[PDB]
Amino acid sequence: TAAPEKNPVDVKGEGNETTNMVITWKPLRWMDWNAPQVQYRVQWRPQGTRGPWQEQIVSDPFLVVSNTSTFVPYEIKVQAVNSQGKGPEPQVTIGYSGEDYPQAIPELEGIEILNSSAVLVKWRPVDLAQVKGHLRGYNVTYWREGSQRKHSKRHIHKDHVVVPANTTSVILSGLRPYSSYHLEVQAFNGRGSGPASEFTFSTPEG
């Protein structure tokens, strides 16, 4: 019997609620314990504030951190410990509290009319500090004038395009010539989508 051989890997820090941050790691292989029982030394503090480290020694491979702010980064260290001592100093990982709906509305750059049937919608990248999460993509919902209206579960179908978070334009084809479209653009993360910006445009006679 001796100190633990290695510290855990696969440290992660992600909450399911904007008031918590679940921390997790990979339980150590028993060959790495060097004793018949092993605990995990878990130190954490926000990144930015850098006060004292909060600390807690639990035996399960996870620790629920509560009473947090919405989506804020924490420094995280996990260190195996037993009767004989501690493992090497842990390596520092970063992890965030829960995600929340986005505050950023997307600002227009220009809407370029290509055909009687296609248009290139170009918005600006959103301020990440307003996303309150990991920016996952952008959400572009467009619909036609809407003249007929005889159905419900699927009336005047509002089509939409999903693009990654690092493309700041999209082409929208398949349009009807000489029509009026509305248009909404949203950022989204894991939680949800932010408020939509509103725009209209018109297709040529074709």
Residues that bind ligand NAG (CB under 6 A): 16-17, 22, 62, 64, 67, 69, 114-115, 117-118, 139, 141, 158, 160, 162, 165-166, 171, 173, 186, 188, 193
The nearest distance, CB 101 to ligand NAG, in angstroms, is 11
The nearest distance, CB 17 to ligand NAG, in angstroms, is 6
Give the whole-angstrom CA distance, residue 93 versus residue 13. Answer: 8
> Based on CB atoms, which residue is closest to ligand NAG, 35 or 165?
165
Give the whole-angstrom CA distance, residue 30 versus residue 147. Answer: 69
The nearest distance, CB 186 to ligand NAG, in angstroms, is 6
Give the whole-angstrom CA distance, residue 134 versus residue 130. Answer: 10
The nearest distance, CB 75 to ligand NAG, in angstroms, is 16
DSSP class per residue in 112-162: EE-SSS-EEEEEPPPPGGGTSS---EEEEEEE--------STTSS--EEEE
Q: Which residue is nearest to ligand NAG (CB)?
A: 118
